[PDB]
Design a protein around this ligand. Structure first.
Ligand SMILES: [Zn+2]
Length: 41
RNA sequence: UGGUG
């Protein structure tokens, strides 16, 4: 089916790295794959 | 921790 373990919640954020674009949970401050910061610095 | 569906 179209269902899966994936989810979406308010405050979530996508990796700013063009080489990553991974979706990250709201409580993370860095990317789950490329460790790129959520803020611009 | 809601982790790769
Ligand atoms: Zn990333």
């Amino acid at each position: 089916g179209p269902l899966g373990s994936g989810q979406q919640r308010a405050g979530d954020w996508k990796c700013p790295n063009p080489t990553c674009e991974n979706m990250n949970f709201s409580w993370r401050n860095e990317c789950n794959q490329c460790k790129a910061p959520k803020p611009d610095g």
